Symmetry: C3
Subunit: 368 residues, 3 copies
């Protein structure tokens, strides 16, 4: 029972689900173990929908940072006088400000849309609600919260008229995720600004995690990363994004983060992870697709790819974070110390220790 390990089978809680897709909400990072108190204000959401669909209009009391793991979508954020549609592609990330009304469309014909997002509530710490404008079989419209009187006066109309149009108390859809008409997708799909290279640093439009070169990358893997330094949207939430791939058989050499708390979500493949903590303590765990493992700050950890892997990671508290490796050539901290100290540190000679470290000729990612 690794506190830092959350099994999907028993850590997710479906909010809405039907034939057109479902939305699941991870559990409270702290409810699991008080050891994760510093994350009580964060949540994990997973959205998956079937081809040619739309998530009816709604807004929530929580900022969101969504990452499109795969598929294609059209995010539309409606304001009080403006509207803005974007065409998110795989690897594309954007930030939906709190209290913003918006809807999602899956223009694709065969492919699905799997979006995973980090939610940050405004009112209740760690908790947030979804307010749907629409009047569906599965949810009332918040407009039904008001009295008939306030309604008759607000819209300037008789109730039966506003009920036979906006509410409907059979004429209303089944759930909040209904199918669309090609003519419609044909019509919604033409004005959504899409991600490009000139967006890496835009306070608005979405940016592509992979559009740039990785930071580390060899025949055994690739580590794509973005930090507040480079992105305005990421400086505000003070978080870093990094999608990293690892070829079956290779692993991410032992390393620790200086001051970032990482939340990695396995996106594809399998993996064996190891976490050391304080007499040291091991915290291994066998992760699978959709599993979430949170790695405390200043904690060495290694990732073993037991099959072609790709995982997403959120770096909470990222401003000026550094990645220290314990093995390999480049960025190895146990190889910068003064010899005499290496001599005094572990039981070995300065040369005997200068020998065991120069063996491994690769850096970052190696092959098992």
């Amino acid at each position: 029972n690794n506190p830092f390990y959350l099994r999907s089978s028993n850590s997710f809680q479906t909010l809405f689900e039907n034939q057109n897709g479902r939305i699941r909400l991870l559990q409270r990072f702290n409810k699991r173990s008080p050891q994760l108190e510093n994350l009580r204000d964060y949540r994990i959401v997973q959205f998956q929908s079937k081809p040619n669909t739309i998530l009816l209009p709604h807004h929530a009391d929580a900022d969101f940072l969504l990452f499109v793991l795969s598929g294609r979508a059209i995010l539309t954020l409606v304001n009080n006088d403006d509207r803005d549609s974007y065409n998110l592609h795989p690897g594309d990330a954007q930030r939906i400000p709190a209290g913003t009304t918006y809807y999602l469309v899956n223009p694709h014909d065969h492919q699905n849309l799997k979006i995973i997002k980090l939610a940050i509530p405004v009112n209740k710490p760690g908790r947030y609600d979804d307010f749907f404008l629409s009047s569906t079989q599965a949810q009332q419209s918040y407009l039904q919260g008001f009295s008939h009187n306030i309604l008759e006066t607000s819209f300037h109309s008789e109730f039966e008229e506003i009920n036979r149009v906006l509410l409907g108390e059979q004429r209303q859809q089944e759930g909040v995720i209904v199918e669309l008409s090609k003519e419609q997708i044909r019509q919604l799909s033409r004005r959504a600004k899409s991600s490009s290279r000139k967006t890496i640093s835009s306070e608005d439009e979405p940016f592509n995690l992979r559009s740039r070169n990785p930071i580390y990358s060899n025949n055994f893997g690739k580590f794509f990363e973005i930090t507040p330094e480079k992105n305005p949207q990421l400086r505000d939430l003070d978080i870093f994004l990094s999608s990293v791939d690892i070829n079956e058989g290779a692993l991410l050499l032992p390393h620790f983060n200086s001051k970032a708390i990482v939340i990695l979500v396995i996106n594809e493949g399998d993996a064996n992870i190891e976490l050391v903590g304080i007499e040291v303590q091991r915290y291994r765990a066998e992760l699978s697709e959709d599993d979430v493992f949170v790695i405390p700050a200043a904690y060495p950890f290694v990732v073993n790819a037991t099959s072609n892997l790709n995982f997403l990671a959120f770096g909470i508290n990222a401003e000026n974070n550094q990645r220290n490796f314990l093995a390999g050539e480049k960025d190895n901290v146990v190889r910068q110390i003064e010899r005499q100290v290496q001599e005094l540190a572990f039981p070995g000679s300065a040369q005997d220790v200068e020998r065991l470290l120069k063996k491994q000729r690769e850096s970052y990612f190696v092959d098992a």
Copy 2:
């Protein structure tokens, strides 16, 4: 028992009080309902004094954002090497940095002074204190806390001297007696008080006026990340249903009455309601739609915590309406009605913000 309603009648606790005035402190926001856990740090104090009086010099361990609701006043903050005075008129606001000694005078002859201030304690969350320098029959000066031996050393006189001239009198902190001002270009002053109504309202029609100042324009507010708003609503008039994007609004009923309807999710929408009167506080969480139906000429103030980059969204009316911006094809998918029906419906309320009931 609506958790978002703080009825004055059974919600305030008197701090000091006499013939010249009283100071009341509203109960803890979270002690009321855990839902307001995010409002634990704030306190809403209510100051009231009669003509020709003064609040003895005193300091507290909590920032203050005062807003003169009515009457005139002379606020004087005294520094360790300076001292400045200001002339507060109704509508004025200003901040009093934590640890700042100060006294208040009400120079008017027949008008009572009514001040409201949001307290932000520095030591213990949501709980602060007052430190009165004055030596009164209602409180001991903080000088009395010192050992005799130290006071003689400190001041340079045998005890009986300081004891006769400093420690001991008057009955109560508010006693009876016998200057910069807020202009139209004071609004961005980093130190002087500014005025909410000196600028144009934002939403204003024959049924009401909406005044609001944001941390964007005033250095003092940006430091607290708070937005102010004073709105007026005619009897019968109604403040169209809307919601705040990210700010948690705290509204205080100044004068008049009104019924407000907060709507929240339980999917089943649950309605929260209440009938507010003079000095009633109601806190509306972020993103929750609410309506202001005034049953008498109403005027209130509103402190919007975490107001940075906020945005106001309206459901009815012809301006700043969200429902009216949902693409044509999608309005027909969400509502049990024709995309032509909805468009027609939404276009029936010619008014904006304030409509007549």
Copy 3:
């Protein structure tokens, strides 16, 4: 039992100790009295090592701000591509970023080394751990948390070798080693105040307050980047036996003061409307925290010197209620001093005049 009084006799706790040095970590401020909630995120660490020793390479999930109370030290910071060493002198302060690896050397031959540090955790509020790279009799190296498969794989070596060459915390040294590690080590200077990397010295500046009875040294988030990032003022003062720091009160800064050397009595006052008095006799290595806007006074019963960390110190203000300079009650209006004191406008002025010195006076 003064909730603000933290006696070292039963507040500190050693995380380790050996005939070569000692490291103690204070109690949780709030663990004592809830009255000190807002201090829950902080801590005080006390390091003390003999002459000619070193602290084997480690790192903690915490932001440190160490200040050297006495003696000379050599701080070596090791990053992934660099290694920086600073020649710290008494009065020198510096910041060791969260998760940074470093070791400490004491080049002195007769003196000792006493360094104090405020830890600001990053993971669990108010609680941090140490991760020592070295393998030792008092601590297992953290490279041992990994399985043998991963260690065998990473280091590209057969286990027996790694185990053979890798697997107290304050151990002795040698002249050679000392000499070696010492050469080339940038040390504090007048051109080192507003830096983000190098350590700076309090006293290498003019004290803001000083008379034949004492000196007040203070650096603020306004002058030193490293302090601005933390928003904490540092201050060291000197008060001679008999003398005493005139009653005053910080406007918004929460002060945690540690007694370096000497002895003194302290008076704090808060409301209970009656005022309550908190009094304690601070001795060497005792901690006393004075909340915001609470007036307090320090009387020295022997030549004294203490260090003070000011939390939430951005735009702080020290107000003195006694003396000639920076006297608040002296700014209040005459036509009003008369209204707030039993005395008369006249009788007060004259009295506020009796004292002639400011800040520090003779007992």
